[PDB]
């Protein structure tokens, strides 16, 4: 019927003064744009069809052509930035927002989808969507006593579009828009649908990826215990954004970090730090590094949860990027910890896997490790057990690595290494 028309045939149908002919040709355009192998998006744009699709959005007396044109425009906006810009240039943003209140849920759902693609292109289009007034009618669609009464795909598309309004930086979304969206986000964060939960965590992920004042906005809503719960989910698409949000939060103040500890997030980290997914261990260890950069009582919580042997583990065997985050976690630990905590660190076996990583080509990790070497010796001087520490390194092949680093580029490596050998290896 309308299967695999030529672009020229679609043009002649849209350019006819027959509404049913225009409807028939618009649907055929939609079918081309929704095909798997290559949608001829650029062919449809070059023929000048976007202004005509946009005009069909306003045909209130002909719902079907509203739907087909909305679907067609949605699929163009899902392409490149240039392609999305073409949809925006045709005036599609106000026309799509006007369709949010359509009595036809499938047309309103399509307008939600289209706005999601437009907002997701970048901060400029995101804020332009916001300026046109999309947030109020979007949130009104979720203003129900129970989210469970909404269609599954409809709620998922609303959640995904909202998360795009929370996404991107330079600039981050407007503060008042974040305040407006955020009570609905929190309600979506407690829904039972896994993908809704995933997109909700991504939205919180985006909102916490900024300065502490953005972070405070989110934590004042009390979402931290829910994020820790989602941190323990089995669905890996939930854990990944949940771990990101938790990691962004522990970049803020020690008080915001403390709320993550108080909510019980540290008990999940034995699993996360042995997680078979490389990125999860990798992200969990970075989060651990920002936790070990906190107060001594928060370092003590790491100790209490048995997490120091787990850091010894990732330092002994992990992906290199993960081992780099483990060194940072150790150096931060050794920088803010007590003598007892730094002593405990060596009793756990941190010295031997720390030496082994003095062989990697990365210049930064050697600086990071050597910083931690110094701090561990620094506590050994308060206990007079320095020489007894020095022999340990000599027996796991260490001094071979340090004294070799005395002849090494970037100087700063050689300075700390020669300084190291000068004081504790006489």
């Amino acid at each position: 019927g309308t299967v695999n028309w030529s672009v020229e045939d679609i043009v002649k149908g849209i350019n006819s003064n027959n509404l049913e002919s225009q409807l028939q040709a618009t649907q055929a355009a939609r079918k081309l744009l929704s095909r798997e192998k290559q949608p001829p998006i650029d062919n449809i744009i070059r023929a000048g069809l976007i202004p005509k699709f946009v005009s069909f959005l306003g045909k209130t007396d002909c719902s079907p052509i509203q739907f087909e044109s909305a679907w067609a425009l949605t699929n163009i906006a899902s392409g490149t930035s240039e392609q999305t810009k073409a949809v925006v240039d045709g005036g599609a943003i106000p026309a799509f927002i006007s369709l949010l209140a359509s009595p036809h849920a499938h047309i309103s759902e399509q307008a939600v989808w289209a706005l999601g693609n437009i907002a997701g292109d970048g901060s400029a289009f995101r804020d332009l969507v916001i300026k046109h007034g999309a947030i109020d009618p979007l949130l009104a669609l979720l203003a129900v006593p129970d989210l469970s009464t909404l269609a599954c795909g409809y709620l998922r598309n609303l959640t995904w579009t909202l998360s795009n309004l929370c996404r991107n930086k330079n600039p981050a979304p407007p503060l008042d828009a974040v305040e407006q969206i955020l009570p609905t986000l929190v309600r979506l964060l407690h829904h039972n649908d896994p993908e809704v939960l995933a997109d909700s965590c991504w939205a919180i992920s985006y909102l916490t990826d900024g300065p502490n004042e953005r972070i405070e906005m989110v934590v004042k809503k009390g979402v931290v215990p829910q994020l820790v719960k989602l941190l323990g989910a089995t669905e890996l698409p939930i854990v990944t954004p949940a771990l990101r949000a938790i990691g962004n939060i522990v970049t803020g103040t020690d008080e915001q970090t403390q709320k993550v500890i108080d909510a019980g997030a540290l008990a999940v980290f034995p699993s996360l730090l042995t997680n078979p997914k490389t990125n999860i261990q990798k992200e969990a260890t970075w989060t651990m590094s920002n936790i070990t950069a906190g107060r001594q009582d928060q370092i003590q919580q790491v100790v209490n949860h048995g997490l120091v042997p787990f850091l010894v583990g990732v330092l002994s065997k992990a992906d290199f990027k993960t081992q780099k985050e483990a060194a940072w976690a150790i150096t931060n630990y050794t920088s803010g910890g007590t003598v007892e905590q730094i002593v405990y660190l060596v009793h756990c076996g941190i010295i031997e896997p720390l030496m082994n990583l003095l062989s990697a080509k990365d210049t930064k990790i050697i600086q990071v490790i050597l910083d931690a070497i110094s701090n561990i010796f620094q506590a050994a001087e308060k206990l007079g057990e320095t020489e007894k520490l020095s022999i340990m390194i000599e027996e796991c092949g260490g001094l071979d690595k340090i004294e070799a680093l005395q002849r090494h580029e970037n100087e700063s490596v050689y300075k700390a290494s020669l300084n190291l050998i000068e004081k504790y290896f006489s």
Binding site: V250, T251, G252, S289, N290, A293, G294, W328, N332, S335, G336
Partner: peptide, 4 residues
């Protein structure tokens, strides 16, 4: 000493 928190980073990103």
């Amino acid at each position: 000493r928190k980073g990103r």
